[PDB]
Symmetry: C2
Subunit: 294 residues, 2 copies
């Protein structure tokens, strides 16, 4: 059953590399982790505030590095996205991270930037709910939260997806992407999306008018070797007001996919709505039939 958590072996490090956390949401998160018998390590600066950021870059880097020093940690679950984790990229000690025993980094939204950087450096990661999702359709939300422990245990290996137009084909490549806006906002920097040839580019977003999505897509595709992608795979675009625009969002995305001669898929249950099922970031997967399979 998909609301059922798997035990998480070892300990989960909780860090806040992006936006600041409300006290009551943090405490509610920890209580839910305890309900589930999850042993955790709380980063020492998770309650820090520096404007809307969870502390200074230096504070956040200390917590992320500490998460990689402790030997019993088997996953690093980001508490909140929002904005700010790209700020850490010029400070990360990548060597100290490759040397630690495997501990997938987990999150979505702004955390997509760190997922991509981790993939570039050969580090495991998971695109899925942030941990404060625990402290906030309710059934879908609960299945999405449960999907993290289930993927860490290796017991889920597929999601449903639909091919939009085109023709029947099989696409195999690395799973990359996440939040369109966050990733576009790293183009031209050291944190630009890692997009090896043949990759399946997953995209989702929230809270944007269509012209801002198109602008972001144009930028992202112009900044990578787009013609060498295997596929573009849309998750959800939630709270994105159409505002009288003549073309649907899928028409716009379809025009871009056609221009680069890459197939387009959609309805992956991933993003800012109730459906946000975890998927392994940077692994080889196959688009076949009606699913994405790893």
């Amino acid at each position: 059953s998909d609301q059922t958590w798997q035990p998480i072996d070892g300990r989960v490090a909780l860090i806040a590399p992006a936006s600041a956390i409300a006290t009551e949401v943090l405490e509610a998160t920890l209580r839910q982790l305890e309900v589930h018998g999850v042993d955790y390590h709380l980063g020492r600066h998770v309650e820090a505030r520096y404007r809307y950021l969870a502390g200074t870059v230096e504070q956040r880097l200390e917590d992320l590095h500490n998460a990689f020093d402790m030997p019993d940690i088997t996953a690093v679950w980001c508490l909140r996205g929002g904005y700010g984790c790209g700020q850490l990229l010029p400070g990360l000690d990548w060597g100290r991270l490759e040397a630690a025993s495997p501990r997938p980094l987990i999150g979505f939204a702004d955390i997509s930037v760190l997922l991509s950087a981790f993939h570039r450096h050969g580090l495991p990661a998971i695109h899925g709910p942030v941990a404060t999702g625990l402290g906030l359709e309710q059934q879908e939300r609960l299945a999405s939260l449960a999907s993290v422990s289930r993927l860490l245990a290796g017991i889920d290996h597929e999601l449903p997806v639909q091919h939009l137009g085109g023709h029947k084909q099989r696409v195999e490549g690395a799973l990359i992407g996440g939040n369109l806006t966050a990733l576009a906002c790293m183009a031209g920097t050291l944190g630009g999306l890692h997009a090896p040839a043949g990759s399946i580019l997953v995209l989702e977003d929230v809270g944007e008018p269509y012209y801002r999505l198109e602008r972001s897509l144009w930028q992202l595709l112009e900044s990578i070797d787009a013609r060498q992608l295997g596929a573009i795979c849309l998750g959800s675009f939630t709270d994105c007001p159409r505002k009288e625009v003549a073309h649907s969002l899928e028409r716009i995305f379809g025009e871009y996919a056609a221009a680069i001669e890459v197939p387009l898929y959609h309805h992956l249950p991933s993003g800012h709505g109730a459906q946000n099922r975890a998927w392994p970031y940077g692994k080889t997967a196959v688009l076949e039939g009606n699913r994405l399979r790893w």
Copy 2:
């Protein structure tokens, strides 16, 4: 001497083109009537009334008009009708040889048009950051509109500023920049900001919460040789709601300018408010005390 509301004659013909967002018919008509009141001979591009979603026609249609503005021998300025979104899309197909072959005809606009201003500067073509032509068809506003003809004629040479942070010594370099969001959105692409060493980076924006401004600023500065800039000079940040954020906008921009060790000025009367005085894009300028001069 003349009042800032007093236009200068424009000789020859002004090409009106719409390389970004689509144009409302009534606003266009009022624009043309104001041009006629001021004795300005204009030519409308064949596709300026095209619509393709929110864009002023397809890429091919807009390229045809932009190219035609450089093919016609009697054109002495190319005044973009509206910004919004879309002119970066023209960069892959733009025939620079064809533009460069034509007699001098400054490109004028702001907002999204900043992207084309920058590309023109990279190709040694004259340009002006100021009101788009439809601003005519909608006292400080009138002065802003008059400033375009006045700058084409070469009679205005300075704008007011105020020092905000960093060293107080004279800065001399090329005037670059414009809209922070639009320029950040070209980072990592063939249309990225042309930012030669020593430049004075003007920034303005509208309608953004502070975290989005910071995200754009972090991207733009990380994507260029920021440390080699001469200065950052802020225009207006119009309708940018603070919403309880603990740090002021001046504090945030101060922190970034300090991080790259570049002096920071503000209160340039340039942007999306009533105060949008024209400045020469890509021209060498001097920033000293309470003035920017060229």
